[PDB]
PDB file of C-alpha atoms and ligand atoms in Angstrom:
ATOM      1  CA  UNK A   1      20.974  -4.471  -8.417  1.00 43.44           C
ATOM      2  CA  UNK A   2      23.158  -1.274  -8.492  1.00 43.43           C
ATOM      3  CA  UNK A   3      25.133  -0.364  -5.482  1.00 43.01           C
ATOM      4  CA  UNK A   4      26.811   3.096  -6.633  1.00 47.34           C
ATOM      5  CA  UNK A   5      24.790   5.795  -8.593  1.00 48.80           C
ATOM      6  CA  UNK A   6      25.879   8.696 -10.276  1.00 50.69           C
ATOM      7  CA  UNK A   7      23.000  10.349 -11.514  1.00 54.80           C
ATOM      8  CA  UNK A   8      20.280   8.233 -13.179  1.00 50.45           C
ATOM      9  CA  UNK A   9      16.383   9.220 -13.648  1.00 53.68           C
ATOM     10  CA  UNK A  10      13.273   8.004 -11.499  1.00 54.05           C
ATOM     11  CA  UNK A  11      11.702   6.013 -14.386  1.00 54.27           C
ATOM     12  CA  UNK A  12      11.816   2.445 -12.752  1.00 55.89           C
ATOM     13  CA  UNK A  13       8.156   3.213 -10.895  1.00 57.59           C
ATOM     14  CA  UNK A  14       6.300   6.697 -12.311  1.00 54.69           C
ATOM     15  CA  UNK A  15       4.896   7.307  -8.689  1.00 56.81           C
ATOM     16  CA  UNK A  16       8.222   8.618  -7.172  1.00 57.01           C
ATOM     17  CA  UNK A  17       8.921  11.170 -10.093  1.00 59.13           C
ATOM     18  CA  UNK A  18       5.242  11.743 -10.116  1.00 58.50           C
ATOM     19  CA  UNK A  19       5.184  12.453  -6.932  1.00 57.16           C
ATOM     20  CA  UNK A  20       8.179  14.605  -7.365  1.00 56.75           C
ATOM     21  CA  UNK A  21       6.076  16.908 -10.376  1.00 58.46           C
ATOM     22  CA  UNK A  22       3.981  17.413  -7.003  1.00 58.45           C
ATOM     23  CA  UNK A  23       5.937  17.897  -4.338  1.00 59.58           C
ATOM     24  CA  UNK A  24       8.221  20.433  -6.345  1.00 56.59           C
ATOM     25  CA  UNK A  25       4.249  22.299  -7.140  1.00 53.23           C
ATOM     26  CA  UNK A  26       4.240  22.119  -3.124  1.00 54.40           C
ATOM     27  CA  UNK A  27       7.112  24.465  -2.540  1.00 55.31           C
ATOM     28  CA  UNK A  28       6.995  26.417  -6.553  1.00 56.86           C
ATOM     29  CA  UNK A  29      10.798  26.167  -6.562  1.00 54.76           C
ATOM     30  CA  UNK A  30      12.556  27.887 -10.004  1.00 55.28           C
ATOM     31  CA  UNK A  31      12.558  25.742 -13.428  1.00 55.97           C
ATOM     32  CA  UNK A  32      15.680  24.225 -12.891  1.00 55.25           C
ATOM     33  CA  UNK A  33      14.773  21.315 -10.877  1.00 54.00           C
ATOM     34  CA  UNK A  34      11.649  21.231 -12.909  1.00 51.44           C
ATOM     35  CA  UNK A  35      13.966  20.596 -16.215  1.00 53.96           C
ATOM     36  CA  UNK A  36      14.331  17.033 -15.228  1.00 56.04           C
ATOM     37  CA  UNK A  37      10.527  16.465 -15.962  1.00 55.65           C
ATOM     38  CA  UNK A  38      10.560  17.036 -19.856  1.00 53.29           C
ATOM     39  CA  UNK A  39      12.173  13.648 -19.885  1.00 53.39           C
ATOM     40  CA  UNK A  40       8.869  11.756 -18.385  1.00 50.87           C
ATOM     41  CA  UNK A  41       7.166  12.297 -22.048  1.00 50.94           C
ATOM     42  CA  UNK A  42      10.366   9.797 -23.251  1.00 51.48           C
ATOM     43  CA  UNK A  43      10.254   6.969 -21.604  1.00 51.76           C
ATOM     44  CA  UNK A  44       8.570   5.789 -17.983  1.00 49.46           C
ATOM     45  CA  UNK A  45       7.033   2.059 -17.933  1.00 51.91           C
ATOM     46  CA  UNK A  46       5.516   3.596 -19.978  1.00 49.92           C
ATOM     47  CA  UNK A  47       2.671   4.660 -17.557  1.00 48.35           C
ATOM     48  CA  UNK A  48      -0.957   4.273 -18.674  1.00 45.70           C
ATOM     49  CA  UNK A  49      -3.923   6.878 -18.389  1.00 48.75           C
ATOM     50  CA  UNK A  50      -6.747   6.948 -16.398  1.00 47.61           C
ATOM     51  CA  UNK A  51      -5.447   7.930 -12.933  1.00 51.84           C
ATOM     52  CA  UNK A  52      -4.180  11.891 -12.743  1.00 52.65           C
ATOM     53  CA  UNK A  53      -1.017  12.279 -15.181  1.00 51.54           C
ATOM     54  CA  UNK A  54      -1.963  15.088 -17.540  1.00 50.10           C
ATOM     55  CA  UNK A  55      -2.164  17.699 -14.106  1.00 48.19           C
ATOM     56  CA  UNK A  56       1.708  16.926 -13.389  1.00 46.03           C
ATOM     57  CA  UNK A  57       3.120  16.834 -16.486  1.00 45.55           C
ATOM     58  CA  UNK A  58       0.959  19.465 -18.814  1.00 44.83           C
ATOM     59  CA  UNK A  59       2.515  22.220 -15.939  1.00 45.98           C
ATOM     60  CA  UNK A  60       6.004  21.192 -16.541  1.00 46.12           C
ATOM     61  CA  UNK A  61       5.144  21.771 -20.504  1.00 45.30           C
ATOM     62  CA  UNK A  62       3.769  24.848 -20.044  1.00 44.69           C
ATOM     63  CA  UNK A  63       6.477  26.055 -17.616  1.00 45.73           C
ATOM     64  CA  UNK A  64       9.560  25.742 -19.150  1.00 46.41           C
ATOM     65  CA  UNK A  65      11.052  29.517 -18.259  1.00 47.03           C
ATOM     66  CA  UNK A  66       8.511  32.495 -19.107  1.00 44.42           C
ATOM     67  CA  UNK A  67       5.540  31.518 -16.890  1.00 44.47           C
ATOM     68  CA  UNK A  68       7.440  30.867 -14.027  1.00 43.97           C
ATOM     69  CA  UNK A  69       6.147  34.987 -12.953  1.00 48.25           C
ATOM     70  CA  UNK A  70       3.297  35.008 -10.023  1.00 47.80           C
ATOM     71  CA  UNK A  71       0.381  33.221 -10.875  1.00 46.43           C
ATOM     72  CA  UNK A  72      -3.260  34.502 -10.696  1.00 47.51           C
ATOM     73  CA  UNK A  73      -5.625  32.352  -8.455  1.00 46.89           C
ATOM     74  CA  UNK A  74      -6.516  29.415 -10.574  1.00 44.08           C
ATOM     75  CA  UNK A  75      -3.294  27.669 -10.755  1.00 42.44           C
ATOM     76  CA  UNK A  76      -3.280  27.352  -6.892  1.00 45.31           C
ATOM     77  CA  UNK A  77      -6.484  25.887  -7.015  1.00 43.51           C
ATOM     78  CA  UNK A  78      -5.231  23.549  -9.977  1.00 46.68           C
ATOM     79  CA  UNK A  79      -2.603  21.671  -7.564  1.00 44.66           C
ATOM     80  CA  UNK A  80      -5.707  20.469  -5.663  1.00 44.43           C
ATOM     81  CA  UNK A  81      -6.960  17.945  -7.978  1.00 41.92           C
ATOM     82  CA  UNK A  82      -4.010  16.033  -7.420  1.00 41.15           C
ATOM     83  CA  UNK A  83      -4.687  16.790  -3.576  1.00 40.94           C
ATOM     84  CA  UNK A  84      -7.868  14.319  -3.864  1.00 46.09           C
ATOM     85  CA  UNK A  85      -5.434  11.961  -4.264  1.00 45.77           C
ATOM     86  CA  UNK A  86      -3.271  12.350  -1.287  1.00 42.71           C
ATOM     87  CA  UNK A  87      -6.247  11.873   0.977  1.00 43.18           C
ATOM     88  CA  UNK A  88      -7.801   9.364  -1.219  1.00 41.26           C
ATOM     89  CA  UNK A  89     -11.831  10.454   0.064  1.00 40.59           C
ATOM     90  CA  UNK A  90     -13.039  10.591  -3.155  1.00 41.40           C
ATOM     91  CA  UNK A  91     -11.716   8.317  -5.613  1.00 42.70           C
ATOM     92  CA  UNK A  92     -12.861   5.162  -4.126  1.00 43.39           C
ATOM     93  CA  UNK A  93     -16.542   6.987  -3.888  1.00 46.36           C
ATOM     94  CA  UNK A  94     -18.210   5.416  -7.128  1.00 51.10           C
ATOM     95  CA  UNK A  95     -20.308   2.536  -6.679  1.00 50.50           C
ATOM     96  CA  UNK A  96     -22.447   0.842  -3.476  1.00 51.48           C
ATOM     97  CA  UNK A  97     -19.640  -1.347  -2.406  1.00 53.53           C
ATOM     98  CA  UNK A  98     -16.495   0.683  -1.474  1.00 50.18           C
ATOM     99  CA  UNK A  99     -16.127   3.001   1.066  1.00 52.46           C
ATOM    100  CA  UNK A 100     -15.118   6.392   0.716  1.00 52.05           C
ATOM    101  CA  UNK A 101     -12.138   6.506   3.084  1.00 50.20           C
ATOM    102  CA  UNK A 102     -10.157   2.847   4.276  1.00 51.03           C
ATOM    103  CA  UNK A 103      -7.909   4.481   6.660  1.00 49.05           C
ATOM    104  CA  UNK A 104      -8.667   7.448   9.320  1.00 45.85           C
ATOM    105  CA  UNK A 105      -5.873   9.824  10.804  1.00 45.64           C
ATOM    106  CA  UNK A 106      -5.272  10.091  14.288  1.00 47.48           C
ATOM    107  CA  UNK A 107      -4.485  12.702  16.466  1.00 49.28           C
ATOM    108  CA  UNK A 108      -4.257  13.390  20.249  1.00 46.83           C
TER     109      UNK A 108
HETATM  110 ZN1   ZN B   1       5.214   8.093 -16.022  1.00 49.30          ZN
END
C-alpha cells in the first residue's frame, strides 16, 4: 500500500502496539515513548475484550508523569500476567481436549 512513511501510529493490527505497551514495561524507559499509548483508547480495530488489554493500557493511564518514581514490589510482579502469555502454558489449559503447551523450546 504505502511505500514512504513519515510518522503514522500502529493501529492497523493491536498486537504490535500491544506488544509495544509490553516491551517498553520490559526495559521501564521514561514517559515519553509511553505518550504514544494514550492514543490506543481512540481508535485501534477497535480491539475486543477478553484476552489481556486492561494490564497494558490501565499502566499507561496511570503513568502519565508523577508515578514514573521507583515502584514498590507489586508492579514488577504485575508485568507477569501478561508473561503467561508469552509462553502461552496456561491459557490453552481449560478443558480435556487441548494441551497445555503446542510448541517446546530447544536448547543444546
Ligand atoms: Zn487495541
Amino acid at each position: 500500500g504505502s511505500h514512504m512513511s513519515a510518522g503514522e501510529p500502529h493501529e492497523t493490527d493491536c498486537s504490535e502496539i500491544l506488544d509495544h505497551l509490553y516491551e517498553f514495561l520490559d526495559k521501564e524507559m521514561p514517559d515519553s515513548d509511553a505518550v504514544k499509548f494514550e492514543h490506543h483508547f481512540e481508535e485501534s480495530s477497535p480491539c475486543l475484550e477478553k484476552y489481556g488489554l486492561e494490564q497494558a493500557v490501565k499502566k499507561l493511564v496511570k503513568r502519565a508523569a508523577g508515578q514514573d518514581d521507583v515502584p514498590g514490589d507489586l508492579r514488577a510482579k504485575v508485568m507477569g500476567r501478561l508473561d503467561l502469555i508469552r509462553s502461552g502454558q496456561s491459557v490453552p489449559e481449560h478443558d480435556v481436549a487441548a494441551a497445555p503447551s503446542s510448541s517446546a523450546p530447544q536448547e543444546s
